[PDB]
Design a protein that fits this description.
Chains A, B: Substrate binds at residues 117, 227. Chains A, B: It catalyses: a 3alpha-hydroxysteroid + NADP(+) = a 3-oxosteroid + NADPH + H(+); a 3alpha-hydroxysteroid + NAD(+) = a 3-oxosteroid + NADH + H(+). Chains A, B: The record marks 84 as: Lowers pKa of active site Tyr. Chains A, B: It is found in: Cytoplasm. The structure is a homodimer of 319-residue chains. Chain A is α/β, with parallel strands linked by helices and 319 residues long. Chain A has a single domain, classed as Alpha-Beta Barrel (TIM Barrel), CATH 3.20.20. Chain A contains 10 helices and 12 strands. In chain A, the strands form 3 sheets. The first copy, chain A, has an 8-stranded parallel beta barrel with strand order 3-4-5-6-9-10-11-12, surrounded by 4 helices. In chain A, helix 1 (33-43) links the parallel strand 3 and strand 4. Chain A starts with 6 loop residues before the first strand and ends in a 22-residue tail after the last helix. Chains A and B meet through strand 1 of A and strand 1 of B. The complex binds NADP nicotinamide-adenine-dinucleotide phosphate (NAP) (2 copies) and testosterone (2 copies).
């Protein structure tokens, strides 16, 4: 069967498809394009979809998914849908409210994985990034351990099959793992990970705790100018990556992706192009040799495309 | 990660690694060879091990598995162990007794999948195939539906995560699916399936019921003279199979195996040879084209290497 549909074990007894499909829509691209791409991803064997409250497209993604359930292509159970809790709902009493909005929007009866988008709380309200009239960002110091307890209850309530975090550093992660009364451990930490920021320490830390590293910007991001510095290196053009790709008669994208899979990372990818969507499904058809992995490991330069500078000087900034 | 370690969904919410490693030891081969092979299989990414009470090697296999858990190579959760209920324990009150012997032998705290080895009951006792002094096989007519209820309780008791059957024909399968009060549906039907006996009807039946077909003798069996007719065709020598293997620069074994995976079968293989064990791990590195699948589909000749003639004329003989 579709090898990219196959699953890996989560520490709570659940299983996640090994390859995920992101749903962020680029600034100048139309939101209906995500419906097109999602249906195509499903047709190509993609069973893991990553979204978020912040993305404002959960209505569209849920629509693409249900149409495929409707026409008998898949069952809810075949789909693994991930969503994320936004910073303005970090207050314990607001966590489930955020999730219930996602459920209402997607029309799915539960999310397979619900995660904390960032370890930073912002003032409750209707704006994603609330600032005062002088531009200061209105944040709060809600303890992650408190928001985490609210996340555990959403799992107990059956609204989320699994719970995890995103953009957490080791200190923040340790804070939750050592929390007294901890009932459910985070099943993953979704962070930026690619050839220029391979996260070997975080990967080692997660392995020792049975937490999986789910990577984003795996192919060097979408270079969306609203959030990616245009003077940053283009990952897929890297000479060493292109030489190796050439050596295996594969594309750089496939080599950048395979590298992650080979090191134990569950990667997220995104393409609104039908040829490229199909192309990524062949990542299991080859295998990098030790020497080549060591080569790619050497491309690391601790470079972030996602600095989270839109969070200004939040006392809890992970980076 | 090891693509042969990846999992497929079972109809009860569990997941099974896509490629299984059998543990039967050939007549003239030493039982300690299975400990060697199992450790090597684990080192190579095999996570699904198929055994049975009848095989008399559960003590050895459990030993190989635990050593790998003990040195930190895997966790119990990483391993999927299958065992089978022997015919002499078909009486409802004896089912759990058989399972508890397996648990005691393997020293695992539960089996991931427990299945009915054959749909034929034999008289209780210490001999696998009890016969009278005149030679007649001492069988019983215990209803499979009754033994099945005993299997459901072992699942409710937590002793077996999943339950299934083996060597059942469609009638016997339908008998259980239509049983009144059925609580748990069989997650699989482990039967003989290869190029000369592809089981297309059974495969279709299973697909419609969400029952997976787990195949054995996938490579044409071990040709063990105690149970395989030496005048039977050698599957891996088949001209058409060798031509196709040649066309993909792959071995016949890999082509015989890939064919099963491509049609939705979860295959079982077995090799006590370290080179061949490693060889089978590359089955995801290529893909047969439609025309080639149709070619291989044509090799079918409804030929069984496993006639179960050791069950003589049991009224419930599946074949
Ligand atoms: N948790 C967080 O804080 C966070 C942050 C950022 C992202 N994410 C997740 O990660 C997902 C992906 O992020 P991203 O889009 O910024 O990064 P990305 O996956 O690294 O890059 C996406 C870009 O790669 C291109 N691409 C896809 N397949 C390709 C192929 N085979 N060859 C060449 N190029 C290919 C796409 O172009 P085309 O469309 O033309 O194919 C697209 O522009 C997001 O949708 C989201 O779900 C999470
Ligand atoms: N449920 C049932 O009633 C039932 C019945 C029979 C079997 N089974 C299960 O199926 C498992 C396998 O059965 P089996 O051994 O009879 O049949 P099989 O898997 O079809 O054949 C095993 C033979 O194939 C050879 N082989 C393995 N890899 C090879 C490769 N890459 N190239 C060439 N040859 C290769 C092995 O030789 P080497 O060792 O030299 O590599 C071995 O002799 C059993 O252990 C058992 O778990 C279940
Ligand atoms: C920069 C931005 C806030 C942060 C967003 C970004 C879109 C992409 C994105 C995806 C994430 O999951 C993390 C937050 C970010 C990085 C948004 C585009 C406009 C908005 O102001
Ligand atoms: C033939 C036999 C009983 C049936 C056994 C066979 C070993 C292989 C085997 C594996 C199975 O799982 C089904 C039963 C069989 C086919 C045994 C070897 C000696 C014994 O008498």
């Amino acid at each position: 069967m579709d090898s990219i549909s196959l699953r890996v074990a989560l520490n709570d007894g659940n299983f996640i498809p090994v390859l995920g499909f992101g749903t962020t829509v680029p600034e100048k691209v139309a939101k209906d394009e995500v419906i097109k791409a999602t249906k195509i991803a499903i047709d190509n064997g993609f069973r893991h979809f990553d979204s978020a409250y912040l993305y404002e497209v959960e209505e569209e993604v849920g629509q693409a998914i249900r149409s495929k359930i409707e026409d008998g292509t898949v069952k809810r159970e075949d789909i693994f849908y991930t969503s994320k809790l936004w910073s303005t709902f970090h207050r314990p009493e607001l966590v489930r409210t955020c999730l219930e909005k996602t459920l209402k929007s997607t029309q799915l009866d539960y999310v397979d994985l619900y995660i904390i988008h960032f370890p930073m709380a912002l003032q409750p309200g209707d704006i994603f990034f609330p600032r005062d009239e002088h531009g200061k960002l209105l944040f709060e110091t809600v303890d992650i351990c408190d928001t985490w307890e609210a996340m555990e209850k959403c799992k107990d309530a059956g609204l989320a099959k699994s719970i995890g975090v995103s953009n957490f550093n080791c200190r923040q992660l340790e804070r939750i793992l050592n929390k007294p009364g901890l009932k459910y451990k985070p099943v993953c930490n979704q962070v930026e990970c690619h050839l220029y920021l391979n996260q070997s320490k975080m990967l080692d830390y997660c392995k020792s705790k049975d937490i999986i590293l789910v990577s984003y910007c795996t192919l060097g991001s979408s270079r969306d100018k609203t959030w990616v510095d245009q003077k940053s290196p283009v990952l897929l053009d890297d000479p060493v990556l292109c030489a190796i790709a050439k050596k295996y008669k594969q594309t750089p994208a496939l080599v950048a992706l395979r590298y992650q899979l080979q090191r134990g990372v569950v990667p997220l990818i995104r393409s609104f192009n039908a040829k490229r969507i199909k192309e990524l499904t062949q990542v299991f058809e080859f295998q990098l040799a030790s020497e080549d992995m060591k080569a790619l490991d050497g491309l690391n330069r601790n470079f972030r495309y996602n600095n989270a500078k839109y969070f200004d000087d939040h006392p809890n900034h992970p980076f």
